[PDB]
Amino acid sequence: NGSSIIEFEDMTWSQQVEDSKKPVVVMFYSPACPYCKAMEPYFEEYAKEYGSSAVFGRINIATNPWTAEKYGVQGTPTFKFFCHGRPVWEQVGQIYPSILKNAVRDMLQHGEECIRKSTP
Amino acid sequence: SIIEFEDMTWSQQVEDSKKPVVVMFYSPACPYCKAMEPYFEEYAKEYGSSAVFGRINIATNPWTAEKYGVQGTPTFKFFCHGRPVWEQVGQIYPSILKNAVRDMLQHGEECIRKSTPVGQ
């Protein structure tokens, strides 16, 4: 649903995520996963609420093993927040929506500093 | 107190642990890791009985770094029987890491339970 949710995929991930200016928030999902379906409405409400501050996208892990592998995603849903090109936060599972909402807000405020205060 | 983990033994020390595991991925040359060390060590001391606390040098252990897609240091992760549930990257105000840890101590297991393994 747009919401402007991007469908990311292996072959252009590096352009769309790692070379992004803006923060990126990603849901790793599987079409088969009941927990992903449970989270989906809230991912879409928060994507709309915060669209001006971040990019939001989903990547199907049934079909995109390379990016799952790259980030060590072992289950679905997995939410990940990217700053400049780099992961800053992750949470796995069906979680209360407010936990997702708050971690997005927190990373929007802190995420750039987290990345500045890490070494590659 | 904290356990040094290594590639060769990771499957036993981390993935086969019955207790949850909190891992700090570090480099000896990283000032952000250095700044976070005492706090990570204090948290290991407060919650020793709920979880195993450990750390792994990524310069010397490239395989687990690749496996979990670690791209900067420090990266903190929480594991439940070898499944990653949460991560945060960077030097951060340390109580943010305490609260994530406390939260995962009580919620990490149900998070993994409410998720679908990537091969399935």
Enumerate domains of chain B plus CATH numbers.
1-120 (3.40.30.10)
Among B87, B91, B89, B72, smallest CA distance to B32 is for B91
3-state SS assignment for residue B9: coil
Record the tokens describing residue B55, joined without a space.
């750390």
Q: How far apart are CA B76 and CA B63, in angstroms?
A: 17
Phi, psi of A33, rounded to the nearest 5 degrees: -90, 115
Method: X-ray
Contact between A53 and A12 (Cβ < 8 Å): no
User: For residue A74, which residues of chain B lie inside 8 Å, CB to CB?
Assistant: 83-84, 117-118
Helices (H), B8-91: 10, 31-47, 62-67
User: At how many Å resolution was this determined?
Assistant: 2.3
User: For residue A36, which residues of chain B lie inside 8 Å, CB to CB?
Assistant: 116
**What is the distance, to the nearest Å, from the Cα of residue A95 to the centroid of all Cα atoms in its chain?**
14
Instruction: Please answer yes or no on whether A74 and B89 come within 8 Å at the CB atom.
Output: no
Size of interface A-B (CB pairs under 8 A): 111
Hunting for tokens 């700053």 — which residue is that? A83
Instruction: Please answer yes or no on whether A74 and B85 come within 8 Å at the CB atom.
Output: no
Record the tokens describing residue B117, joined without a space.
């393994």
Among B63, B69, B68, B55, smallest CA distance to B27 is for B55
Hunting for tokens 């040359």 — which residue is that? B29
Interface test with A, best of B57, B93, B97, B115 (most A CBs within 10 A): B115
3-state SS assignment for residue B46: helix
Q: Is B46 left (phi over 0), alpha (psi -120 to 50) or beta?
A: alpha
By C-alpha distance, the chain A residue nearest B70 is A71
Instruction: Please answer yes or no on whether A87 and B110 come within 8 Å at the CB atom.
Output: no
Q: How far apart are CA B85 and CA B90, in angstroms?
A: 17
